[PDB]
């Protein structure tokens, strides 16, 4: 179907959209469009595209399609495929040498550097109104950044990985667990000319590489996590560190679940 | 003794040389006049200490031959109605503490850091935040100070609250104290026991002296603060902020100092 | 000077800026910037550039220059010359085959065509909130359009003419009045290879063509007029026609005064 | 004070004696004039340091009585429009680093050896290669140098970047520093504290001085480089290359040296 296809897309970010069920349960377009939007926004925070400065909408067209839009302008439709959506987002983002977004989550306006001490940041969390920090190296290969808009502060934690890199990570895991050592050697010697992901796909049925490209996992993967704090907690420094630890461990589990899901896909792929 | 001259003497009570009487004779178009009038009223508002920066102050020449004073678009008073009427119009809009400082946040609804704040935490807000505002903090001598930034401009207000009636009694004392005829000076100090310093010098009771000077702008508006502004990179340099705080307190002492001199000239006659 | 140069620029739109005098009369930057802005906006309505959808600012730089900006972005400085300002505006405008702006004064959003009857427009003037009309052919080679933003309606009347076309119109008038018929014939036979404006300039001193290019009249001319109606009059249909007739005759006089000014410039050009 | 004389003074700012005014009076055919004009503009381009050698610079006499300046076939500006307009026309085409040198490769798209290169590796490219180009490398003193070859001709450009405005302030200092009346010299140095070296000498602010000299070619074009060329067997002799590098730096010091002398004559009057 088409609503289920949008769901498989949201699953690549760890979002339980369940639009196929809502689209079934009769329903007004407003609930559909509203639920589609709330799903697409939640997915943007984890894909690591770096488009927080944009308004993300998902609407149900009179075609029967699902139109995904940025700043009110149509990006692609779900019926176009997920490569069209990734290629739609592609010119909209600017990524540095680490795969981190060069854009600012609050738009243009000064944002502090990553060299900022936690004490100077502590007063920004407690006595500034709107502020943003650049990317600073997080705890263990991870990266992080913080910003507040209005009465809500946002902490983002990112371990940048492309969809191809996420699949190669799970391709290593699959080959590492083949009980047949003979097949294992065969896959390892062909990994020189084809790579780990290419060697595994070559030893599947002839259409696996093509079937893989049609899945949303081929172009979208969990790259970051966003934790929100509101009310008085948004100005609490200790509460901020508590949310930072909560988010980095949430990203690690989501990135861990993705590898397990991809492993069972590289073993069986329609 | 015209109407444009009436505004000039009103701006003269804030140390603002509007030169509206010349610009009126200048055969300048009305748009330039309204701009000169409006920008002058804003300059005076920062020095009158009414604490109405959260309002949009506006002045415009009526097609009636008068000039109208607006706040947030609604007309408050017209200059031909008397300077007390404008003071009476502003007064209900003001929220003043027991020290004479506005409790109004200059930036509106939001977070306001306390005057308790250490200068150390202030320096971070100057350099790494965007929009911020502090409350009232005790400054050099008996003055008070606050600081805020809206967009690309930084605002430094240092104030020493003194009512218009309080400035009159102080100038009335400076003239009474300077009286060389011990016999005449003793007479005024005898009247001041009941009628006060201003009532004694005017040979009346207190409220009678207030009624004598009713149409005088100096009897309704004085200078209680000074606003120094920085824009651009200087608005983010804490070394240049500190410099602006001193320039504002120096101009406050100067502008507060010439109003008691000018007032002595007014009171010395009768 | 530099402030006088901005004034000569405003004179090309029929605006009495008088900034050289204000810049002399001491003054705060805010009055300068505010007066500069109010002047530049009034001039945009008559130059016929078609940039109503833009925010026009003019500020005094710390250089001593005058910075003209569009939507908050610097376009050019007065010290750069007027060709730089015209070339700055040039890529910002879209003009049709008649020299009329293809942009909308209210931005994107539906606007009615020029084929709209006055009766259908009458209800738009009386019961719509925000509306705009496309260019319709006005009364006698003239063009017109109407729109309302908020509590203010705007009627624009335009006789499109480039600065070169305005100068050639005044070049015809100068040659048509030469008492020396011999010189007249001489200028007319050279008008075949050089044109009317080129022939007259050739018979002046050798540096007139270069001196002409440095004047603001070489790149800016009165092309339209804008009449504003506010309050209850903004919704009055008869008052709208009264303003339309007021504006088209204002443009005709302004275009008539320009030709007279240019005639006395082509006769004498420093 | 004609138009051909206007080009000659424009070429005089690059040390190029075009003698176009004489060639115009010479009753020479237009093809010879366009050739003299075009080849002169190319000579000046190598010394202006605009770094536009990847472009085809062209000049031709319009049938309008003007002369038109082309780059890659498209018209950039016409000489009667003012020398700033030509500077303003070239400026967006330039790509300049923080040192004032063109980042543009003189040969276009291809490989460019770095300025890091040892002279040893350069000698092989001189003797055994065909087409090659080096980047910018620090040369004798504070100058910079690059070298390239296209076909049978070798190009040696040595540059010391200095803007036109920077050359004016330097000449304004040389005249101010030479003032013998200690009283007058002290006055100019007091103005230079705010208005700068050029503004102080002209009795104005900085932007006012820029506006005074607007129509002067020396205010928009100076010499920042020199190009020395070898063709034939000398273009493959590293011993003759080294000789050309010195001849170019000697002519750079000479041509840069006479522009500050000539500029002192210009500034000394007012």
Residue D25: other Cβ atoms inside 10 A:
10
Nearest alpha-carbon partner for D9 in D264, D262, D268, D186: D262
Dist. CA B200–CA B190, nearest whole Å: 8
**Most A-contacting residue of B130, B135, B154 (CB-CB within 10 A), to test interface:** B130
Interchain CB distance below 8 Å, C28 and B42: no
How open is the CA angle B154-B155-B158, to the nearest 5 degrees?
145
Q: Tell me which residue of B156, B131, B173, B127 sits closest to B245, measured CA to CA.
A: B156
Kind plus residue range of the DSSP H or E element containing A73: strand A73-77
* Burial of A266 (C-beta count, 10 Å sphere; 0-12/13-18/19+): buried
CA D53/CA A99 separation, integer angstroms:
37
Compare all CA atoms of chain C with the CA of B36 and give the residue at the minimum distance.
C31
C65 interfacial to chain D (CB closer than 8 Å): yes
Q: Which residues contact A184 (CB under 8 A, 6 or more apart)?
A: A175, A178
Q: Which chain D residues are closer than 8 Å to C191 by Cβ?
A: none
CA C126/CA C116 separation, integer angstroms:
15
* Chain B residue numbers touching C150 (CB-CB < 8 A): none
Contact C77 D195 (CB under 8 A): no
> Measured between beta carbons, which residues in chain C are less than 8 angstroms from residue B19?
25-27
Report CB contact under 8 Å: C22, B38: no
Of D2, D88, D207, the CB nearest to C65: D207
Contact C194 D85 (CB under 8 A): no
Structure tokens at A182: 């003979």
Q: Specify whether the CB–CB gap between D84 and D220 falls below 8 A.
A: yes
Contacts C40 to B, Cβ<8 Å: none
Which of B21, B24, B39 to mutate to probe the C interface, most C CBs <10 Å? Answer: B39
Contact C197, C204 (CB under 8 A): no
Q: How many CA atoms lie within 13 A of B68 on its CB side?
A: 13
Task: Please state the separation of Cα C187 from the chain's center in Å.
Answer: 30
* Contact predicate C74/C117, CB 8 Å: no
Say if residue C49 is exposed, middle or buried (CB neighbours under 10 Å; 0-12, 13-18, 19+). buried
Cβ atoms of C78 and C2 within 8 Å: the answer is yes
Q: Give the residue from chain D lying closest to C78, CA to CA.
A: D211
**Sign of the torsion formed by the C-alpha atoms of B266, B251, C30 and C79:** positive
What residue of A is the nearest CA neighbor of B126?
A128
- The answer for C 15-34 residues in CB contact with B (under 8 A) is 15-18, 21-22, 25-28, 30-31, 34
Tell me the two tokens of residue C38: 């109010």
Radius of gyration of chain D (CA): 20
Which of C15, C25, C34 is the closest to B35 by Cβ?
Answer: C34
Chain B residue numbers with beta carbons less than 8 Å from the beta carbon of A116 are: 128
CB burial of residue D64 (10 Å; 0-12, 13-18, 19+): middle
Map tokens 């008068």 to a residue: B66
C-alpha B243/C-alpha B225 separation (Å) is 17
* Contact between A127 and B110 using a beta-carbon 8 Å cutoff: no
Element (DSSP H or E) covering residue B57: strand B57-61
SS3 state at D28? coil
Contacts with B39 from chain C: Cβ below 8 Å: 28, 30-31, 34
Q: Distance of CA B247 to CAs B141, B235, B241, B252, D191, Å?
A: 15, 15, 10, 8, 22
Residue A12 to residue D107: CA distance in whole angstroms: 48
Q: Which of B151, B160, B146 is nearest to B228 (CA)?
A: B146
Q: What is the resolution of this structure in A?
A: 2.7
Separation CA D6–CA D18 (nearest Å): 11
Total Cβ atoms within 10 A of residue A107? 12
The DSSP result for C52-85, as a single string, is TTS-EEEEE-TTS-EEEEETTEEEEEGGG-HHHH
Residues of B in contact with A237 (CB under 8 A): none
CA B125 to CA D255: how far, in whole Å?
52
Residues of C within 8 A of D199 (CB-CB) are: 64
| Helix orientation angle between D238-267 and D164-178, rounded to the nearest 10 degrees | 60
**How far away is chain D from the Cα of C218, in angstroms, using its nearest Cα?**
10
Query: What residues pair up with B227 in beta bridges, in sequence order?
Result: B157
Report CA A186 to chain centroid distance, whole Å: 34
In this structure, are strands C66-70 and C56-60 parallel, antiparallel, or unpaired? antiparallel
Determine the distance in angstroms separating the CA of B71 from the nearest CA of chain C, rounded to an integer: 18
- What distance in Å separates the CA atoms of residue A51 and residue C38, rounded to the nearest whole number? 38
Q: Which letter, b or e, does each residue of D177-213 get, where b requires 16 or more Cβ atoms within 10 Å of its Cβ?
A: eeeeeeeeeeebeebbeebbbbbbbbebbbbbbbbbb
Q: DSSP secondary structure string, D108-166?
A: -SS--B-TT--HHHHHHHHHH-SSEEB--EE-STT-EEEEEEETTEEEEEEE----HHH
Tally the residues of chain D: 270
Contact B125/A130, CB-based, under 8 Å?
Answer: no
Secondary structure (3-state) at B145: strand
Query: Which residues have C-beta within 8 Å of that of residue C23, sequence separation ≥ 6?
Result: C3, C32
Q: Are strands C152-158 and C143-149 parallel, antiparallel or unpaired?
A: antiparallel
Burial of residue B227, with CB atoms counted within 10 A of its CB: 0-12 exposed, 13-18 middle, 19 or more buried = buried
Neighbours of chain D (3+ CB pairs under 8 A): C
Q: How far apart are the C-alpha atoms of D228 and D47, rounded to whole Å? A: 10
Cβ of B26 and C28 within 8 Å? no
Q: Which of C108, C160, C116 is nearest to C134 (CA)?
A: C116
List, as ranges, residues 95-114 from B with C-beta within 8 Å of A.
110-111, 113
Give the other-Cβ count within 10 Å of B27's Cβ.
8
Sign, Cα dihedral of B251, B257, B261, B267: positive
Give the residue on C whose Cα is nearest the Cα of D65. C194
E strand or H helix that includes residue A180: none
CA distances in angstroms from C42 to B30, C90, C153, C158, listed in the order given: 12, 19, 16, 15
**Residue D193 CB partners (closer than 8 Å, separation 6+):** none
Residues in chain C: 270
Pairing, β C224-230 against β C152-158 = antiparallel
Cα C108 from Cα A6, distance rounded (Å): 32
Looking at beta carbons, which residues of chain B come within 8 Å of A126?
A: 113
Asked if C42 lies within 8 A of B31 by C-beta distance, the reply is yes
Distances in Å between the Cα of C139 and the Cα atoms of C1, C102, C121 are 42, 20, 17
What DSSP state is assigned to residue B131? B
| Torsion region of C48: left, alpha or beta (phi above 0 gives left; psi -120 to 50 gives alpha) | left
- What H or E segment, with its residue span, contains residue D36? helix D30-48
Angstroms from C219 CA to nearest CA on chain D:
11
DSSP-derived secondary structure for C74-130:
EEEEGGG-HHHHHHHHGGG--B-TTS-B-S-TT-SS--B-TT--HHHHHHHHHH-SS
Least Cα distance to C251 among C217, C221, C219 occurs for C221
Give residue for tokens 């003012």. D82
Q: Do C83 and D80 touch (CB under 8 A)?
A: no
Give how far Cα C182 sits from Cα of A99, B247, C1, C178, C185, Å.
79, 71, 40, 9, 5
What is the SS3 assignment for A210?
A: helix
Residue C159's region, left for phi above 0, alpha for psi from -120 to 50, else beta, is beta
Detail the DSSP E strand segments found in chain D.
57-61, 67-71, 74-78, 132-133, 137-138, 144-150, 153-159, 225-231
Q: Give B31's contacts in chain C (Cβ within 8 Å).
A: 38-39, 42
* Tally of CA atoms within 13 A in the half-sphere of D218 that contains its CB: 21
Neighbours of A35 (CB within 10 A): 17
Exposed/middle/buried for residue D110 (C-beta within 10 Å: 0-12, 13-18, 19+): exposed
Tokens for A197, please give them. Answer: 């992901």
Other beta carbons within 10 angstroms of residue B169's beta carbon come to: 20
Q: What is the C-alpha to C-alpha distance for residues C155 and C248, in angstroms, rounded to an integer?
A: 10
How far is the alpha carbon of B155 from chain A, nearest alpha carbon, in Å?
16
Give the end-to-end CA distance of chain C in Å, rounded to a whole number: 15
Whole-number Cα distances in Å, B205 to A65, B267, C151, D71, D78: 85, 15, 52, 87, 81
List C-alpha distances in Å: A38 to A30, A58, C234. Answer: 12, 8, 42
**CA D30 to chain CA centroid, nearest Å:** 27
Per-residue buried b or exposed e for A209-221, using 16+ beta carbons within 10 Å of the residue's own CB: eeebeebbbbbbb
Angle at which helices A163-175 and A181-194 pack, to 10 degrees?
150
- CB contact, 8 Å: C81 with chain D? yes
Tokens coding C119: 């009766």
Cβ(C105)–Cβ(C226) under 8 Å? Answer: no
Sign of CA dihedral C69, C70, C71, C74: negative
Distance, in Å, from the CA atom of C211 to the CA atom of C199, rounded to the nearest integer, reads 16
3-state secondary structure of C153: strand
Helix and strand numbers (H, E) in chain B are 9, 8
Contact B111 A127 (CB under 8 A): yes
Instruction: Please name the residues between 33 and 52 in chain B that touch chain C, using a CB distance below 8 Å.
Output: 35-36, 38-40, 42-43
Residue reference for tokens 């092989």: D124
What residues contact residue D173 under an 8 Å CB cut-off, 6+ apart? D197
φ and ψ at residue D262, rounded to 5 degrees? -60, -35
User: In this structure, is the dihedral angle defined by the CA atoms of residues D90, D96, D100 and D104, taken in order, positive or negative?
Assistant: negative
Q: Is the dihedral of CA D124, D130, D135, D140 positive or negative?
A: positive
Does C86 contact D at CB distance below 8 Å? no
Chains B and C touch (3+ CB pairs under 8 A): yes
**Tokens coding B57:** 């102050």
Angle at D56 between CA D51 and CA D60, to 5 degrees: 120
- E-assigned strand segments in chain C: 56-60, 66-70, 73-77, 131-132, 136-137, 143-149, 152-158, 224-230
Least Cα distance to A225 among A152, A132, A156 occurs for A156
Q: What are phi and psi of B134, to 5 degrees?
A: -100, 160
For residue B41 the two structure tokens come to: 């009223």
Contact D33, D208 (CB under 8 A): no
- Give the whole-angstrom CA distance, residue B20 versus residue B5: 7
List of chain B residues whose C-beta atoms are within 8 Å of the C-beta of residue C34: 35-36, 38-39
- Closest by CA to A234, choosing from A226, A243, A225, is A243
Residue entry with tokens 């007319």? C188
Q: Is A268 on the interface with B (CB under 8 A)?
A: no
Residue (of A66, A63, A57) closest to A22 by Cα position: A66
CA A121 to chain B, closest CA, distance in angstroms equals 8
Facing C18 at nearest CB: one of B32, B40, B42:
B32
Tokens encoding A66:
């699902």
Residue of chain B minimizing CA distance to A111? B128
Q: Which of D211, D212, D214, D216 should be substituted to probe chain C, the one whose Cβ sees the most C Cβ atoms within 10 Å? A: D211
Distance between CA atoms of B150 and B155, rounded to whole angstroms?
8
Q: Residues for chain B: how many in total? A: 270
Phi, psi (5° rounding) for residue A104? -105, 140
Give the C-alpha distances (Å, rounded to integers) separating C24 from A196, A217, B209, C18, C99: 77, 69, 41, 10, 38
Backbone angles phi, psi at B159, to 5 degrees: -130, 150
A244 vs A138: CA distance, rounded Å:
10
Least Cα separation, residue B101 to chain A (angstroms): 21
Of B117, D216, B218, nearest to C81 (Cα)? D216
Contact residues on chain D for C63, CB-CB shorter than 8 A: 205-207
Mutate to test the interface with B, among A109, A115, A117, A128 (most CBs of B within 10 A): A128
**Partners of chain C (3+ Cβ pairs below 8 A):** B, D
Whole-number Cα distances in Å, D123 to D120, D130, D238, D259: 5, 12, 6, 34
Other C-beta atoms within 10 Å of A3: how many?
A: 20
**Which of B26, B31, B35 has the CB atom closest to C31's CB atom?**
B35
Contact C163, C171 (CB under 8 A): no
Q: Kindly report the number of other CB atoms within 10 A of residue B263's CB atom.
A: 24
Burial of A194 (0-12, 13-18, 19+ CB in 10 A): middle
């Amino acid at each position: 179907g088409i609503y289920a296809a949008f769901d498989t897309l949201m699953s690549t970010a760890g979002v339980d959209s369940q639009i196929a069920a809502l689209a079934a349960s009769e329903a007004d377009a407003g609930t559909l469009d509203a639920a589609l939007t709330q799903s697409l926004q939640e997915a943007q925070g984890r894909w690591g595209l770096g488009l927080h400065h944009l308004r993300h909408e998902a609407r149900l067209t009179d075609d029967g399609d699902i139109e995904i839009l940025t700043d009110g302008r149509p990006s692609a439709r779900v019926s176009e495929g997920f490569g069209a959506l990734a290629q739609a987002y592609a010119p909209m983002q600017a990524l540095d040498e680490r795969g981190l977004s060069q854009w600012a989550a609050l738009g243009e306006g000064y944002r502090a550097p990553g060299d900022l001490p936690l004490a100077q940041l502590k007063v920004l969390i407690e006595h500034a109104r709107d502020f943003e920090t650049d990317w600073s190296a997080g705890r263990g290969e991870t990266f992080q950044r913080v910003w507040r808009k209005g009465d809500t502060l946002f902490v983002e934690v990112a371990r940048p990985a492309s969809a191809e890199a996420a699949l190669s990570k799970a391709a290593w895991k699959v080959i590492a667990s083949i009980k047949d050592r003979a097949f294992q050697r065969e896959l390892m010697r062909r990994s020189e000319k084809d790579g780990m992901l290419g060697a595994l796909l070559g030893a599947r049925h002839a259409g696996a590489k093509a079937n893989l490209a049609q899945l949303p996992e081929a172009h979208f993967t969990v790259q970051a996590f966003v934790q929100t704090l509101s009310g008085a907690a948004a100005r609490n420094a200790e509460e901020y560190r508590a949310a930072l630890k909560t988010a980095a461990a949430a990203l690690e589990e989501y990135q861990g679940v993705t590898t397990r899901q991809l492993s069972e896909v590289l073993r069986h792929g329609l």
